[model samples]
Target: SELDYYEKFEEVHGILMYKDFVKYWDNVEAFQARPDDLVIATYPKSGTTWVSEIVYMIYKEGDVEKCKEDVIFNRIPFLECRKENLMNGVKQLDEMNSPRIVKTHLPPELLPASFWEKDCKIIYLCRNAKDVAVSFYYFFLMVAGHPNPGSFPEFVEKFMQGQVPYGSWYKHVKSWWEKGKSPRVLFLFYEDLKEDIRKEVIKLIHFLERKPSEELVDRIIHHTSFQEMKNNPSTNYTTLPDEIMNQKLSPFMRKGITGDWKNHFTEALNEKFDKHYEQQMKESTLKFRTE
Candidate 1:
């Protein structure tokens, strides 16, 4: 079956996920969170890696050598990542030290209630749908055995219909947007970070309650800049296993610039996406800038 690799998944507790996803669910559902634990939440390709690097730098207090020691995966395991069809993330989380920075693309409903109950700090990053759609299309082609999306139009159609992985992008963003209202959650936009990264870094430092000197903040900002991380193997996703990462396709980092969607979406496609995105985001106070 063309769906053999990734399309094989089940719906559990309203989230559509693959086999190991259930194991992750069981582990996360029962896990207890500490007051100091930090979470970085997002839909894929919405600055998860970039923000993870920034948060890691802040945690390290801008120690460039320490930040460069290990790949970001070992520092902040993707909460739902399955290694070799096993619940590897469970072991990863179990072994991580306190005040750990965790990453997840899961929607709010599926998150462990303990995170909210303990008032753990959360940073959720979101990107405009048009850009997300384009980034996701390339990401899909990067997986070794995943089914091909065929073309950009085909990909966008599936994305809008919630047939893609993680289900509805609209529902995912909206769920987190509402959750962002909680004191525990700090919702962020990708475009905003691109516009002014230093300001965003300061906000993150303040949210995390770290009082590093302004010198350290500036260092962290420099270390985690788009070009720096893109060129640094530790943060560039180069450590990803060959079996999972297709070497022929684009690097996982891709373009860090905003408005790359402008290069891909046709005039009609742009109009279609704008219409759908507006309808999906209407009634929500959250606004995403496409340009």
Candidate 2:
């Protein structure tokens, strides 16, 4: 009760959301989606900043200066964030320029109806559930308004059970993979991006229907690389107010890669999860990179 601003959980229909979201509920549901909007939907810690930077780079036509003008979150406004004062996502989107770059962790069901109605392009970024769980364990340490995450092992079980903030990583990823496959949604993987960022950057450009010059494409590749974006103040997320995002505990951009879960999961846990995963995604055809 003595923690940050909010620690309560609110369930909209059945999806678990931070208590903060409840306050901005009406505005978010009523949010108007412009035809030029680009939605970046990812489970938390699924290379969101990396993808945002790449998309923003492409949006600016690979102009390096445009990337520096504001922090990544500001440029691609998180469409559900309502932590600060009265400035909400809907307001931010309304005031932004044309061809807006927007981000949201909400699944297709939770998404504002207008986004689908307007037919805006949605980019869905997915990561290995193991690595995503590992990344998220640390991620919770720095973030505000969540119940105490007991330990790494405990968190993974909760993660699989749909007890965490966003609930069921399996459901989140599977639903997106199955239903979000229309031409409007560009599904991408964290491992594939790590394997060859240049290739992925080009794919993103093509998906956005942009044809940047080769030189510009190369520039974007350099700009959004994990190492490069980690140090870049705009993309790193260090500039955020400590009260909300305490980077001192765990840097927001910590260790961007696959297989980090190897260090965190125990043998028993891995075996159990492997079996659980097999059953959860057996019918679905979505594959993620574990290495």
Candidate 3:
């Protein structure tokens, strides 16, 4: 394979190269697993930071100050790829005292069977497909190594065909939502969480076996709000490595509001998308904000 088509920190699923970076990532996946580790799985750009912050807050116990300043990679971490950047993520999580909270964009089928053994809790987050398309469009641009620099129409076309990185977004979210049907798995709707974060934070903490006191819940809501998080250098991924940030990339907080897809998608495009949505995901209990 050309290897030129894939974006930074991403490679073809089954292909391997003789390059140092490829070897680094290949070995990164084989690290030992712990039964108590918590995993946060989501399709990328779907309020991952907000939900990750929520996961951190539940474990942190009213420690909003540390949560704000310290690199969040130290707390809730991501699995499956992004190794060169996330060495600190692995280090911090490894050093965490107990019950480490982790995050990933990996498919459920790729994860180890031990993860689903009724021990650890997996919180899966899903956003509306149109909004995720918009978010992924900008995010793909932010990557310096990405080769697919198409216009919104072109990107949406690729997305409809499921040609972008991480493969099919529909399959990514649907598999996790449909096949992951255990009490250990909690499905969160990003729109619902965005509309009423205060309630959601409390509910999330309660799910993690750590109920925030009224005051603590208010603090987490305040810290994770769109405005609060955008300018906050610590929480918003402002500290991303200079190599990744200086490549004329957008910050992680681009358009915290929903409905960005309306700016670019025409009625015809929407209709075409709906038709494919039928084939990939229809009659599914999954619901999201497309409005």
lDDT of 1 by residue, 83-192 (tens): 45543665688787887888888898887888878888899999988899888889878865356778898788878878766888899999899888888899999998
Give the alpha carbon lDDT tens digit for every residue of 1-291 in model 2: 224313557677587778877777888898999898899999988988888888888888888898899877778888887875754677788899888988899888888999989999899999999999988888778877766777787788778887777778888898899756698888999999989877888888899888957897899888887788889998888888888789889888888778888999999999999999999988988987798
Model 3 earns a TM-score of 0.86
Query: Candidate 1 versus the native: TM-score?
Result: 0.93
Q: CA lDDT of 24 in candidate 2?
A: 74
Candidate 1 vs candidate 2, lDDT winner: 2
Question: What are the Cα lDDT values of the candidates?
Answer: 0.81, 0.84, 0.71
Poorest stretch of ten by lDDT in candidate 3 = 14-23
Candidate 3 lDDT over 1-291, as tens digits, reads 124444333444532211223545544455455777888888778888888887777777868776865676545665544445545444555566677777776667665455666367888888988999888888777755555547787778877766666567887888888766887888888888878888778778888887568888887878788888787777777778746654246777887877887887899888888888888777677766776
Clashes of each: 0, 1, 2
Q: Which stretches of candidate 1 lie over 4 Å from their true place?
A: 1-6, 84-87
Backbone clashes in model 1: 0
Backbone clashes in model 1, listed as residue pairs: none
